[PDB]
Amino acid sequence: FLKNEKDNALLSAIEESRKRTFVMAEEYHRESMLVEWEQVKQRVLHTLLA
Amino acid sequence: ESHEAFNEWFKHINSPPQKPTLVGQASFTEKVAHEHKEKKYEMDFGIWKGHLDALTS
Amino acid sequence: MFVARSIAADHKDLIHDVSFDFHGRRMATCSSDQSVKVWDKSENVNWHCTASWKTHSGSVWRVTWAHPEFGQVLASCSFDRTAAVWEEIVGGQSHWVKRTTLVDRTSVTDVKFAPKHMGLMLATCSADGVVRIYEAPDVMNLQWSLQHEISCKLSCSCISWNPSSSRAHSPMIAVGSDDSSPNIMGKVQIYEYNENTRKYAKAETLMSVSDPVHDIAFAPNLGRSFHILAVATKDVRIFTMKPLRKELSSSGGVTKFENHTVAQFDNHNSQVWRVSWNITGTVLASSGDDGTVRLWKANYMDNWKCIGVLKGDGNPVG
Amino acid sequence: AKDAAFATLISDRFLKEYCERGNFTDLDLIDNLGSAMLLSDRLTFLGKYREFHRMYSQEQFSEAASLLLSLMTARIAPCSFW
Amino acid sequence: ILCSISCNSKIQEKIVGDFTQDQNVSQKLMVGFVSCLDSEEAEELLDSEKEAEDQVKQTNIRYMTKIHILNLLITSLEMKAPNLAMFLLGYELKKPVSTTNLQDSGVLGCPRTCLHSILDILRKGTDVRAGPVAVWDTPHLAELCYQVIYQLCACADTSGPTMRYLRTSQDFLFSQLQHLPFSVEESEISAMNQMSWLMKTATIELRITSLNRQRSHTQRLLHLLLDDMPTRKVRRKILRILDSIQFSNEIPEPLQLDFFDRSQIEQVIANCEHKNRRGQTVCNVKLLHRVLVAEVNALQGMAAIGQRPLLMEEINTILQYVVERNKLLQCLHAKRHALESWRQLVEIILTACPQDLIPTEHRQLIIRDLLQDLHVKILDDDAAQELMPIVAGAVFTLTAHLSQSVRTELKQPMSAGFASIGDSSLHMILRNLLEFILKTGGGFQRVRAHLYGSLLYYLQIAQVFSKLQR
Amino acid sequence: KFAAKFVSHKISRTRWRPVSASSLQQPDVFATGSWDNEENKVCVWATSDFGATSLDEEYQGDPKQLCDIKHPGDVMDMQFLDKERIVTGSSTGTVTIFRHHENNQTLSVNQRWEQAHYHVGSNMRAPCTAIVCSSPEIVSVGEDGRINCFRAESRDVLRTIDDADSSTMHGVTFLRTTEILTVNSVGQLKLWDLRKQGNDPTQIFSVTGERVPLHCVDRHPNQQHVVATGGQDGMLCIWDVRHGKMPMSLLNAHEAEMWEVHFHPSNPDHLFTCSEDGSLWHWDASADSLACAWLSTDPTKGQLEITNLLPSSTLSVNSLDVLGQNLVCGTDAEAIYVTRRLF
Secondary structure, three states, X not given: OHHHHHHHHHHXXXXXXXXXXXXXXXXXXXXXXXXXXXXXXXXXXXXHHO | OHHHHHHHHHHHHOOOOOOOOOOOOOOHXXXXXXXXXXXXXXXXXXXXXXXHXXXXX | OOOOOOOOOOOOOOOOEEEEOOOOOEEXXXXXXXXXXXXXXXXXXXXXXXXXXXXXXXXXXXXXXXXXXXXXXXXXXXXXOOEEEEEOOXXXXXXXXXXXXXXXXXXXXXXXXXXXXXXXXEEEEEOOOEEEEEEOOOOOOOOOEEEEEEEOOOOOOOEEEOOOOOOOOOOEEEEOOOOOOOOOOOOOEEEEEEOOOOEEEEEEEOOOOOOOOOEEEEOXXXXXXXXXEEXXXXXEEEEEEEEOOOOOOOOOOXXXXXEEEEEEEOOOOOOOOEEEEOOOOOEEEEEOOOOXXXXXXXXXXXXXXXXXXXXXXXOEOO | OOOHHHHHHHHHHHHHHHHHHOOOOOHHXXXXXXXXXXXXXXXXXXXXXXXXXXXXXXXXXXXXXXXXXXXXXXXXXXXXXX | OHHHHHOOOOOHHHHHHHHHOOHHHHHHHHHHHHHHHXXXXXXXXXXXXXOOHHHHHHHHHHHHHHHHHHHHHHHHHHHOOOOHHHHHOOOOOOXXXXXXXXXXXXXXXXXXXXXXXXXXXHHHOOOOOOOOXXXXXXXXXXXXXXXXXXXXXXXXHHOOHHHHHHHHOOOHHHHHHOOOOOOOOOOHHHHHHHHHHHHHHHHHHHHHHHHHOOHHHHHHHHHHHHOOOOOOOOOOHXXXXXXXXXXXXXXXXXXXXXXXXXXXXXXXXXXXXXXXXXXXXXXXXXXXXXXXXXXXXXXXXXOXXXXXXXXXXXXXXXHHHHHHHHHHXXXXXXXXXXXXXXHHHHHHHHHHOOOOOOOHHHHHHHHHHHHHHHHHHHOOOOOOHHHHHHHHHHHHHHHHHHHHHHHHHHOOOOOOOOOOOOHHHHHHHHHHHHHHHHHOOHHHHHHHHHHHHHXXXXXXXXXXXXXXXX | OOEEEEXXXXXXXXXXXXXXXXXXXXXXXXXXXXXXXXXXXEEEEEOOOOOOOOOOOOOOOOOEEXXXXXXXXXXXXXXXXXXXXXXXXXXXXXXXXXXXXXXXXXXXXEEEEOOOOEOOOOOOEOOEEEEEEEOOEEEEEEOXXXXXXXXXXXXXXXXXXXOOOXXXXXXXXXXXXXXXXXXXXXXXXXXXXXXXXXXXXXXXXXXXXXXXXXXXXXXOOOOOXXXXXXXXXXXEEEEEOOOOOOOOEEEEOOXXXXXXXXXXXXXOOEEEEEEOOOOEEEEEOOOOOOOOHHHOOOOOOOOOEEXXXXXXXXXXXXXXXXXXXXXXXXXXXXXXEEEOOOO
8 A cells, every 4th residue: 555655645745734724724713803802892991981 | 191192102103104015927117116115115114113212202 | 350461472483372380380382483481470470481492393282281299291292293291400490301202103183191190191192093191100200101092083183181080980081083074973082991901992972073073171070970071163062971870799891971961052153162161160261263262151050151252452342 | 298109219319319428418317217217118228227327336336237137138228238 | 498488478378378288288397397496406415516517507507597487487477367477376277367276285186386386495594605596687586476476466366365375374474574684795785675575565465464354463463563672672673674774885995097097087987887777877797898998998008018017907906996886886776775665664554554553652652763763864974865765755654643643642531641752752853853854955855845744743733832832 | 455457468477676675665666577478568567656645545546557568479587687677588588688767667678688598409499487686697597408697787698507407497596696596397496506617506406206397486585595496286395405305394385386486575484375276375484473484394383374365266376576565466367466465
């Protein structure tokens, strides 16, 4: 199954690219959620000041 | 210092000049090259022996 | 912007030839006045006559220099049926001394020293249709031994050694044939030295040269896998000669050739009389009855073109 | 040049000169040929013969004579130096 | 003559038909070939070679015969079928090339075939001075036998009758693998080739045996192969095999010429060294002999006849040197292929193996040791550049799998799961990795790509952590 | 550190005009000889503009040609005899004295010896390979193996040593007022007494077993027994002409032929060498500071500091000259390099 092992190596490389995309995309979504939370907090602070 | 001098002496005594050997069917050019090698060996041996006696002292 | 500066030669009779030495520091001139003169180039780029002597009682047809490894040696050939070898015996007492006269039946039409790696050899050709090859057995004693006679079966007008020093090529000579021969074609023949027979054998005949041949020149090979030959006839012809393939199992032949005419030029406008390559074999000079010298060169697409034309007054054509 | 042929040529020019004057020109060069003496048999003969003359000047008479005999028997000498 | 004939594909058919028309005929021809190869050279009559050149050439002829025969067999096999090879190896043409029942010689009237014969051969244990005649050419014989077993399924259709026969009747692979590595210093080349073929073979073997489900078999096999742990620090056999491969080789004394240019001779050596079938630049006898004669002819020494003995001795040394260089290049391509073998074999095996790796702990320990040793070996200034890509792919695979393994432990429940892990060790591994990354010049982009991939997989494991990152 | 002047001729020789020992003026004028052209010349050059009285401007000044004269043959060697007179050896075997007329910025032929060097028997001209001056005395050597002695005011050759060498002599220097050293194509340094009536050298020095050509020779200014030579192998040899027949030191200096060697005239702990390999090296024997530092046989005493003064990839540096803080050199790259701030 030497050819299978070569195919597996290619598969592992694809998996690594996929994990990179998984991490960066998740981080971007988390950053967007954090920005929305910060905006909500700022609005609450403005309401308290009112 | 005594161990260093002994090690220098011991290296030098174990590196004598090689006496040229004549291969038994040497051409006329190879015999002249041998006499030049033998004169070079006697000179190199004289220098080696003088250095050995200095290191021995 | 070539510049030509006249010198007062003051020749007794018009000199039919001029030959430079291998270094271009000396030249020899020859004339109807029966003399050869030698001229040395000073540091100031001026020419001075350093020797002048009466050489023969016959039309000196050709003059050639030996390679400088054999010393300051000249050969000449003549209508008197002889070739002569000359050595520059200098003391400032130069007096080109006749060392030998080769006397082996008709006008000797051309004379050429062989390439130096073959030793001190001299080829002559004669109107009897024979090429003769002589060797000096001692370079210090310029005695000559007849090594070869090559029967061309046509009047010989000119000869050229193949200058190739490659051990992959046997010694080769091109020969011509002045005979008008209303019919016989093949007026350029190629001879190759055969090591097995110890004789020159006819390797090729350029059948396309049915016109009388006045001059021939092999180009310097400079690492090409094929030879180039210029031929002066009614036109300028350039041939490529490709040697055929081979097997190491056995071999004893002239190894037949594939020959292509790569250029033919009628632009001379008169029977082209001479052809000469520059030292790199990249520019050809030709002369003809039109009273001009023309210069020919290939571009990077192997297209040959003329690149200069001259006048009787000495001015280059605008 | 390793030029052994030209080496022999110059050896022979020096020989013309010595057949004639009874002495070598440029003694110091011949004495220092070393391994270059082996470039040609003629040069070899020249150098060995110069060594023989050196032995003769040093009163090493036996040595000089034996060197001469060996040269003569090896026929390195040209057949007139016999 | 027979083998020569063999070398033409078309005729095999006519030939086989001929051999078989008569029952007596086929029988006799075949078993004659067979007993012939059982070269039982004089055994107990007070010595085989009691006389002289005679029995020496006897043995020589026996050898050449063996050779021609085996070559024939091999060539035939690959051609097609029913091939002369199928008849000689004991596969009946009438029976399906897949339904054939291979039996030990003498069981149910089965004649001794080539199979039985080669088996007997290698079984003896070839400590013999003969070694494999492949020495100056080919095969170790053993090589042809392993090839026939592989083609069982490799060349289609021979299936596994061979593997079933080698497992049940002869316990062949276990008996032979116990003696690895073969120390044929003689031809490190030979030893290496032996090892290579053995590799491919046992590899496909285990693969298919497991694809089936034969656990005990697979068990014993791998158990042994890996337990460097002393039973009844004993380095694991796989690591011992790797220790036997030196990836650094000595270099030839520089050529010295009195009359002659050196730089020119090195250029001439570089030129006439033509490419052998393995892609090695070697003049081989060819260019050597003829090239040396041509050089002697070119060096003209007319006048000074006297200097001849010298030139003679000098050319001899040049010859010796070029010979040594060629020997070395050969030894090198061999090692390259052997390494390929090792790598692929091992890796594929373990990683595609049905994971029954009980102590994933031990699994990882093994991975660790391996990586360590490899790194050590390759980080050496004298390591052959030709072995680098192999190491590279190896590391890539190893690392991805190891990372998966790490998470496979971080994702369970039982101080016993990061116990044998080693972060320091993670770190040292990292260090070695980086070192190798650095040492890799622009040339080996591919190696760097594998290493970048391995590093990325490693970094995913860390996704004490803050301390490790720092 | 160097101003480079391209001059459309290869430069065989460069020399500074000698300054009076009483002058506080830095050397400002030098001469050059050309070679390997159809028309060769001797040129005179200035480094300063006659008029810049600012002590504070960075010398970016290209050297300016003051005057020239056509020189038959290739200027094989060149020396100043004094402030007004330049001596040359020619490839034609002629020795020539030129006079420089500073007021008019012209060169003129003052005197010539057209048969200084020639082969006996053929009367063929032989190249004059080196010259040395000690006013009013001039010595020349050539490919004919002759040593000629001239006096600048004498039309006749004062002395010839015929057949002094059977090999080409390449270099000559004064050991003392009546003694010279020569170097030749067989690796010999020869000592001559110009008063001895015979044609044999007084002494012969050589490296044992090797016949490498020596091209250059210079004498230590203060130590009349210390001599430097350069060879075809690029080796720098240091000699004590009182001690043995062998060099005291053999130093790997260049990768090709060493054309010139010069001790610094006023600070002889410095030495300079130039080569066919295109390099120009400064050697400093002062770095550890009367045992001449150049004669130290102790590799632990006297670290020589060695500096290449020119950029990598010059063509052959055929000549150098050094005077005070100034160095000039000439090259096959049709270039003159000048520095006025060596140290």
